């Protein structure tokens, strides 16, 4: 359940990172057994990236990918995947191209607290049309809704089984609100271009994130509402949800207009009230999925596989999604393990 | 191990054409996909597998055509309707059947 504010409420008035790449299978590799080949890219900025899955020196045709999301430091991450049956001879790899790379990089395949978060990304495409807008919603480490301006439906779409229950009134409202979020970010891109005296031909990125945390008693803990321009902090709500943090003089002008209009009070009402109310509904409707704990199957490199949630403690490689709701991790040098699903 | 011999670049007037060629050395069982990128980063122009599966960059679709002579492990890039924005160094590349990439020195292409 997204924020529902009027158009003029969140309108603005006034560092490239190279991707980390991981290639792996969802399950342990077994000849003749259907599996999924994954290429997890993360920690990169800007969002434009070209990812290919290679089989025996040629591109794999039907490759799907996850919806664009980003981490607390505003860097993006994506999962590229495809179904495959590995055999003895076949060799697989991932090729990644990005503005930070002088040439495409190839990586071979070596064979009870809760939260609700919404992530919004809008990237300007001068001349090539309206900005590319992608919105995703999370409950804990599970994506459940999405919106892509380039997709055909022009609707908010389900990405979890427990959200498909919701009726047309729900989807109409979320579709209406996410389109308003997009309209806000499009205007903000044009506004921010002028405030920084930037050329109309350059591509720029606007990012918005907000959500709420609850404890094991499902009572409100903390709320967030943050905003970034080109991967850098612009304006954010402080932990108390009544005052703002601005980065530079352009964001300080926005801060004053929002303080006079009492924008923080409207966001506080959503984050402390509406956000927790629908998070509780989601945790109930998806209890079989969201309230489960999956213990890590364990097997100097320490392995941990097929666990949920992603929080875990073990060269340390980033925790990665398996593509089926579970996660993976390994660490290289006794090995210490800590997870919520294991006594 | 693998050597990529490039040829076919140079100067051309707007609307003119050019045919790049890239020949791979070594055994024919050593290179699968062959193609071109063009110049910080380099962008995909066109490539083709041994079986003939082609892929084109968005900014050259319709104008550029890649083809292959499997009997000689050599690919050709027919560049039609060239524009000043096509001016770049075009780098030939090849992928082994174990996903090892090989890169040529590149050929400058300039459009008046």
Residue numbers in the entry:
A (entry chain A): 1 to 14, 25 to 121, 144 to 331, 344 to 358, 372 to 390, 401 to 410
B (entry chain B): 3 to 41, 45 to 117
Provide the authors' original text about this structure:
Human MHC class I proteins, or human leukocyte antigens (HLA-I), bind peptides, mostly eight to 14 residues long, for presentation on the cell surface for recognition by cytotoxic immune cells. HLA-I proteins are composed of a polymorphic, integral-membrane heavy- or α-chain (α1, α2 and α3 ectodomains) and an invariant light chain, β2-microglobulin (β2m). In order to coordinate α/β chain co-expression and incorporate specific peptides during secretion from eukaryotic cells, a linked “single-chain trimer” (SCT) construct, coupling all three components into a single polypeptide, has been widely used. Success was ultimately achieved by isolating and recombinantly expressing the VHH domain from a novel, high-affinity, anti-β2m camelid antibody, allowing the crystallization of all SCTs tested.
The YML 14-mer peptide was found in two different, out-of-register conformations using two different C-terminal anchors depending on SCT design. In contrast, when a disulfide is introduced between the second residue in the peptide linker and Y84C, the YML 14-mer binds identically to the YML 12-mer peptide, with p2 and p12 occupying the primary anchors in the canonical register, using binding mode 2. The disulfide did not form between the introduced cysteines in the linker and residue 84, but between the cysteine at position 14 of the YML peptide and residue 84. Formation of the unintended disulfide occurred in both complexes in the AU. The Y84C mutation should be avoided for cysteine-containing peptides due to unintended disulfide formation between the peptide and heavy chain resulting in off register binding; use Y84A instead.
